[PDB]
Short mmCIF file of C-alpha atoms and ligand atoms in Angstrom, two decimals:
data_model
loop_
_atom_site.label_atom_id
_atom_site.label_comp_id
_atom_site.label_asym_id
_atom_site.label_seq_id
_atom_site.Cartn_x
_atom_site.Cartn_y
_atom_site.Cartn_z
CA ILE A 1 12.16 2.69 -3.22
CA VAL A 2 11.26 6.61 -4.85
CA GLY A 3 14.59 8.98 -5.25
CA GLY A 4 16.96 6.07 -4.00
CA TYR A 5 20.17 4.26 -5.97
CA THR A 6 20.82 1.06 -7.08
CA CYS A 7 22.89 -0.74 -3.88
CA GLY A 8 24.82 -3.18 -5.42
CA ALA A 9 24.43 -6.93 -4.70
CA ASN A 10 24.41 -8.01 -1.97
CA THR A 11 25.22 -5.03 -0.74
CA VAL A 12 22.26 -5.70 1.88
CA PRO A 13 22.59 -8.64 2.99
CA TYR A 14 19.96 -8.53 6.03
CA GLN A 15 17.62 -8.03 3.22
CA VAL A 16 15.45 -10.75 2.70
CA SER A 17 12.05 -10.83 0.25
CA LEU A 18 8.86 -12.54 1.23
CA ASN A 19 7.47 -14.86 -1.61
CA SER A 20 4.28 -16.41 -2.16
CA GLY A 21 4.57 -17.43 -6.08
CA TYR A 22 5.81 -13.56 -5.85
CA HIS A 23 7.61 -10.86 -4.36
CA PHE A 24 4.92 -9.12 -2.05
CA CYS A 25 6.86 -7.37 1.21
CA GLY A 26 10.54 -7.81 3.00
CA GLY A 27 12.21 -8.27 5.95
CA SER A 28 15.06 -8.01 7.95
CA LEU A 29 17.16 -11.57 8.67
CA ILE A 30 17.51 -11.32 12.66
CA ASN A 31 19.28 -14.51 13.89
CA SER A 32 19.91 -17.47 11.51
CA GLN A 33 16.02 -18.87 12.60
CA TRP A 34 13.76 -14.86 12.65
CA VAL A 35 12.92 -12.51 10.12
CA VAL A 36 11.48 -8.92 11.09
CA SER A 37 8.76 -7.50 9.41
CA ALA A 38 5.73 -5.55 9.07
CA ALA A 39 2.05 -7.64 10.42
CA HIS A 40 0.53 -5.93 7.50
CA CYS A 41 3.13 -8.86 5.36
CA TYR A 42 1.05 -11.56 7.17
CA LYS A 43 0.48 -14.20 4.79
CA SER A 44 0.35 -18.48 5.21
CA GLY A 45 2.63 -19.77 2.61
CA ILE A 46 5.71 -17.63 2.61
CA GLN A 47 8.79 -18.70 1.65
CA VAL A 48 11.67 -16.24 2.68
CA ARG A 49 14.35 -15.77 0.00
CA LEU A 50 17.22 -14.14 1.48
CA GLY A 51 21.27 -13.54 -0.72
CA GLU A 52 18.97 -11.83 -3.36
CA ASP A 53 19.70 -8.81 -5.99
CA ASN A 54 17.69 -9.41 -9.29
CA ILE A 55 14.66 -11.55 -7.13
CA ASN A 56 13.76 -12.47 -10.62
CA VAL A 57 16.57 -14.33 -11.49
CA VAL A 58 18.68 -16.59 -9.94
CA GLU A 59 21.88 -15.77 -9.97
CA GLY A 60 24.21 -17.71 -7.31
CA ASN A 61 23.40 -16.21 -3.69
CA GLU A 62 19.89 -17.18 -3.35
CA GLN A 63 18.86 -19.15 -0.07
CA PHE A 64 15.44 -20.61 -0.40
CA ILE A 65 13.43 -21.23 2.97
CA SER A 66 10.14 -20.95 3.82
CA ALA A 67 8.98 -20.47 7.36
CA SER A 68 7.19 -22.34 9.61
CA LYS A 69 5.55 -20.07 12.22
CA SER A 70 4.29 -16.43 11.81
CA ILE A 71 4.14 -14.82 14.72
CA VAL A 72 1.62 -11.67 14.66
CA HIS A 73 2.50 -8.82 17.26
CA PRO A 74 -0.58 -9.24 20.02
CA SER A 75 -1.21 -5.57 20.05
CA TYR A 76 -1.67 -5.19 16.51
CA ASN A 77 -4.44 -2.92 14.97
CA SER A 78 -5.06 -3.38 11.20
CA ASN A 79 -7.06 -0.49 11.54
CA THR A 80 -4.77 2.23 13.17
CA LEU A 81 -1.30 -0.09 12.08
CA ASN A 82 -0.28 0.81 15.40
CA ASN A 83 2.68 -2.49 17.02
CA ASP A 84 2.87 -3.54 13.45
CA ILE A 85 5.51 -5.75 13.19
CA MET A 86 5.62 -9.75 13.51
CA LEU A 87 8.24 -11.75 12.98
CA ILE A 88 8.95 -14.76 10.84
CA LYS A 89 10.70 -18.70 12.25
CA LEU A 90 12.64 -20.40 9.10
CA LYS A 91 11.84 -24.49 8.34
CA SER A 92 15.86 -24.40 9.00
CA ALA A 93 18.81 -22.20 9.47
CA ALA A 94 20.11 -19.65 7.04
CA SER A 95 23.88 -20.65 5.71
CA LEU A 96 25.82 -16.94 7.07
CA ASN A 97 28.12 -16.14 4.48
CA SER A 98 28.54 -12.59 3.74
CA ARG A 99 26.40 -12.00 1.38
CA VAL A 100 23.49 -13.94 3.73
CA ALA A 101 24.18 -12.29 7.28
CA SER A 102 21.76 -10.61 10.56
CA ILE A 103 21.18 -7.41 11.60
CA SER A 104 21.83 -6.09 14.77
CA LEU A 105 18.64 -4.55 17.86
CA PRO A 106 19.66 -1.47 18.74
CA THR A 107 19.98 -1.27 22.27
CA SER A 108 18.50 2.21 22.04
CA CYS A 109 16.64 4.40 20.30
CA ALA A 110 17.95 6.23 17.52
CA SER A 111 17.02 9.94 17.40
CA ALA A 112 15.88 12.27 15.06
CA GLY A 113 18.75 14.13 12.62
CA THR A 114 20.73 10.07 12.33
CA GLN A 115 20.72 8.81 9.32
CA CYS A 116 19.45 5.88 7.71
CA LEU A 117 19.17 3.05 4.29
CA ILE A 118 16.38 1.93 4.02
CA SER A 119 15.69 -0.91 0.58
CA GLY A 120 12.77 -2.68 -0.96
CA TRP A 121 12.38 -4.43 -4.82
CA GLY A 122 9.00 -1.09 -4.16
CA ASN A 123 7.57 0.50 -5.96
CA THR A 124 9.67 3.39 -7.89
CA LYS A 125 7.48 6.25 -8.80
CA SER A 126 5.70 8.23 -7.03
CA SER A 127 2.97 8.97 -10.02
CA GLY A 128 3.13 5.60 -11.57
CA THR A 129 4.31 2.22 -11.50
CA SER A 130 7.88 1.25 -12.21
CA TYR A 131 8.33 -2.50 -9.70
CA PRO A 132 12.35 -2.84 -9.93
CA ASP A 133 13.92 -6.42 -10.03
CA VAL A 134 17.95 -5.49 -8.20
CA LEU A 135 16.99 -3.68 -4.98
CA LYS A 136 16.75 -0.36 -4.45
CA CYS A 137 17.95 1.79 -1.64
CA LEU A 138 17.58 5.25 0.10
CA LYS A 139 19.56 7.07 2.46
CA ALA A 140 17.10 8.97 4.64
CA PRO A 141 17.39 10.92 7.69
CA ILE A 142 14.84 10.51 10.53
CA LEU A 143 12.38 13.32 11.34
CA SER A 144 11.62 15.27 15.27
CA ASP A 145 8.67 13.27 16.81
CA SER A 146 6.88 16.58 16.22
CA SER A 147 7.14 17.09 12.55
CA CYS A 148 5.75 13.57 12.30
CA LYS A 149 2.77 14.08 14.00
CA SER A 150 2.02 17.24 12.08
CA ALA A 151 2.05 16.22 8.85
CA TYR A 152 -0.08 13.15 9.67
CA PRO A 153 -2.54 14.98 12.81
CA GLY A 154 -4.06 12.66 14.47
CA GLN A 155 -2.43 9.14 13.43
CA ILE A 156 1.21 8.53 14.55
CA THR A 157 1.72 6.51 17.58
CA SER A 158 4.22 5.55 20.36
CA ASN A 159 5.12 3.49 18.22
CA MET A 160 5.74 5.04 14.83
CA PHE A 161 8.53 7.49 12.99
CA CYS A 162 8.52 9.21 10.26
CA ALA A 163 11.67 9.81 8.14
CA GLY A 164 12.13 11.19 5.31
CA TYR A 165 12.57 14.21 3.28
CA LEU A 166 9.03 17.06 3.57
CA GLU A 167 9.51 18.55 0.64
CA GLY A 168 9.19 14.67 -1.56
CA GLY A 169 10.58 13.34 -4.37
CA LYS A 170 12.45 10.58 -2.16
CA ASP A 171 10.33 7.76 -0.30
CA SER A 172 9.57 3.57 0.62
CA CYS A 173 6.86 2.68 -1.06
CA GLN A 174 4.52 0.04 -2.45
CA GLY A 175 5.89 -3.71 -2.60
CA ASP A 176 9.09 -2.08 0.03
CA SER A 177 7.06 -2.83 3.35
CA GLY A 178 8.16 -5.00 5.84
CA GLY A 179 11.43 -3.97 5.17
CA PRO A 180 14.17 -2.69 6.72
CA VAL A 181 15.21 1.19 8.10
CA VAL A 182 18.97 0.65 9.01
CA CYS A 183 21.03 3.51 10.91
CA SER A 184 24.31 3.27 12.52
CA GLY A 185 23.84 -0.62 12.37
CA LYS A 186 21.30 -1.05 13.57
CA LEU A 187 17.10 -2.33 12.88
CA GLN A 188 15.70 1.27 14.20
CA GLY A 189 12.30 0.62 11.91
CA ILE A 190 10.19 -0.84 9.65
CA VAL A 191 8.71 0.12 6.49
CA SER A 192 5.58 0.77 7.72
CA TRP A 193 2.49 3.63 5.19
CA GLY A 194 2.58 6.61 4.37
CA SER A 195 0.05 8.41 1.86
CA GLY A 196 1.26 8.10 -1.63
CA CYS A 197 4.54 8.04 -2.14
CA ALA A 198 7.69 10.50 -1.33
CA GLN A 199 5.04 12.86 -1.47
CA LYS A 200 4.83 17.01 -0.01
CA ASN A 201 4.42 16.57 3.75
CA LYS A 202 3.85 12.87 3.38
CA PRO A 203 7.13 11.26 4.43
CA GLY A 204 7.28 7.43 5.54
CA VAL A 205 6.45 6.07 8.35
CA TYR A 206 7.90 3.44 10.35
CA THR A 207 7.13 0.99 12.97
CA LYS A 208 9.76 2.26 16.01
CA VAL A 209 11.78 -1.01 16.56
CA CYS A 210 13.01 -0.11 20.19
CA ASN A 211 10.58 -0.98 21.31
CA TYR A 212 9.99 -3.85 20.28
CA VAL A 213 12.96 -6.08 21.57
CA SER A 214 12.30 -7.43 25.00
CA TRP A 215 9.10 -8.26 22.37
CA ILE A 216 11.48 -10.21 19.87
CA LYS A 217 14.41 -11.77 22.44
CA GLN A 218 11.54 -13.30 24.74
CA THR A 219 9.69 -14.82 21.70
CA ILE A 220 13.03 -16.02 19.99
CA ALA A 221 13.90 -17.58 23.35
CA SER A 222 10.22 -20.43 23.59
CA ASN A 223 9.70 -20.25 19.88
N1 513 B 301 7.13 5.48 2.51
C1 513 B 301 5.00 4.86 2.01
C2 513 B 301 4.52 3.76 2.33
C3 513 B 301 5.24 2.36 2.62
S1 513 B 301 4.85 1.37 2.96
C4 513 B 301 3.96 1.17 1.05
C5 513 B 301 2.20 1.13 1.06
C6 513 B 301 1.88 1.39 -0.09
C7 513 B 301 2.07 2.52 -0.20
BR1 513 B 301 0.69 3.70 -1.78
C8 513 B 301 2.73 3.89 0.12
C9 513 B 301 3.54 3.51 1.30
CA1 CA B 302 17.99 -13.08 -7.46
CL1 CL B 303 -3.77 3.26 8.81
#
């Protein structure tokens, strides 16, 4: 996250870190057994780390649980990033408590102008590289479809939205991928892509979670 703030330990209790020897992506706990992330975060050998604040120090509220199954969306295209969503099932159920909690799925799509919270352990510089150990947060609005399209001609599908600031300075970044965009208490986006980070006229692009709720629920119901 570029231009954000330190969230505070365990104040984003649905935020998980995906670890394969090191943190490589975020995700969102949606029930005791299942995490939402980006399909471009897929790999084998994932350990899900719940209850994290400093990802390099054991602080006392973590739960580490290995994935049993990853399901990439049926229509994910890794060239266009259309349908950039996957589900990860945990080998054992998480202990839910005030610091490890699931985030509700939307019941309708959110509108442009709605405020959201974007969070992760990604790069904090727009030029340059610096990775934080504690979780960072950014409050940012969803941008209109028309400004998103004009920012990225030929690249925004109906399964994507933009959020952030056309002026630049405040955005998600490499290492935030797969993490949450929560708006009015619902998971509306997944950190997906952009062109650099926090550049003028290049806002972040996010998977549009409201399009996937019936695939998410039916997948969970049979897996
Ligand atoms: N918002 C931009 C963005 C999101 S994930 C990611 C990975 C690499 C880079 Br560079 C930018 C990004
Ligand atoms: Ca920790
Ligand atoms: Cl792309």
